[PDB]
Amino acid sequence: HPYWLPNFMDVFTWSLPFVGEKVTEMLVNVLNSHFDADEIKRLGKRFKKLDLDNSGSLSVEEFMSLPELQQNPLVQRVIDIFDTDGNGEVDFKEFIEGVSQFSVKGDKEQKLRFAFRIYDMDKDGYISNGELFQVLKMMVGNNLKDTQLQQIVDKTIINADKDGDGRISFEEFCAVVGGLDIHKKMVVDV
Amino acid sequence: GVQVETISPGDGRTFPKRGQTCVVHYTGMLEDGKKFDSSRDRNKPFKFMLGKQEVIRGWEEGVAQMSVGQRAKLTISPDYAYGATGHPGIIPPHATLVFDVELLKLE
Ligand SMILES: CC[C@@H]1/C=C(\C)C[C@H](C)C[C@H](OC)[C@H]2O[C@@](O)(C(=O)C(=O)N3CCCC[C@H]3C(=O)O[C@H](/C(C)=C/[C@@H]3CC[C@@H](O)[C@H](OC)C3)[C@H](C)[C@@H](O)CC1=O)[C@H](C)C[C@@H]2OC
Ligand SMILES: [Ca+2]
Ligand SMILES: [Ca+2]
Ligand SMILES: [Ca+2]
Ligand SMILES: [Ca+2]
Fold this sequence. Notes:
The structure holds two protein chains of two kinds.
Chain A: H1 11-30, H2 37-48, H3 60-63, H4 75-82, H5 92-99, H6 108-119, E1 126-127, H7 129-140, H8 146-160, E2 168-169, H9 170-177
Antiparallel strand pairs in A: 1-2
Chain B: E1 2-8, E2 21-30, E3 35-38, H1 39-42, E4 46-49, H2 57-64, E5 71-76, E6 97-106
Antiparallel strand pairs in B: 1-5, 2-3, 2-4, 2-6, 5-6
The structure holds ligand KXX and calcium ion (4 copies).
Site (Interaction with PxVP motif in substrates of the catalytic subunit) (chain A): 138, 142
Keywords (chain A): Calcium, Cell membrane, Cytoplasm, Lipoprotein, Membrane, Metal-binding, Myristate, Phosphoprotein, Repeat
Pfam family, one (chain A): EF-hand_7
């Protein structure tokens, strides 16, 4: 008998509260555009304190130096999304533009665009089956069987794939997610 | 908060500490007893590390009071569970939860 999520839930509605919680936790811990002069100046101080090797770019090793991020399964995705030019590390401009997506007085649509970018690994604008499984696997780990996780991934995409190309576009993702108001959870003080 | 009630006792000495990983089987029910989730139905035990903010506060405070082999009923108030918001599509707001948890192993 195939596995169903509680209340026959789709994997987006199911994992989004954890996504919004763990991304907010990461940034709040990193901090311990839409910014004004003082808010950018505050972020420049907290950036240089985590540079460690003074290379001018936050790397994966420096991000995992904080003990609060060691067991956060969404660290690498946030680093990958911040890495706009895709060089493996995070510059200060990428740091400012990455934190700006979570500032209050930010747009709702851009906060859903970040939530979409959590699952869209290759950043082509479409969530593929392998992408959705792999990102959910980082959060689920061993707590589900791969067969169970694969089954709910299949049903979610099949029900959400409106145009029938096997992938989930941002418009299809917004049709499943829109009523969740996940943007209200993605807020960090600067 | 969380009320721990023993169903079956385990070895009294080995209690999970911060940093350890608790391997459990659980069945989650609403206060009226209606089941909403069960790791036994999945044939996959649930695992989490204590002190790393991975579970609700009722599980953090409740499972810590448990020991290896013990099976207990955990009655959790909303403030220690999902509060006045609930969990979207599963847990209603202000919902008191009852968890039948058994601590299988620590690793
Ligand atoms: C990819 C998302 C990820 C899911 C898993 C890795 C699979 C895992 C088996 C969860 C079940 O998935 C089938 C399922 O189990 C429940 O049914 C349950 O019985 C419970 O309550 N559990 C169950 C575990 C014991 C404690 C308690 C609990 O803490 O769960 C946490 C939880 C939901 C925390 C929320 C997250 C956002 C935040 O706002 C809120 O703040 C109060 C707390 C889970 C483990 C997250 O750490 C990880 C995921 O979410 C709850 C109802 C929903 C939950 O599904 C999501
Ligand atoms: Ca560096
Ligand atoms: Ca970069
Ligand atoms: Ca993609
Ligand atoms: Ca599609």
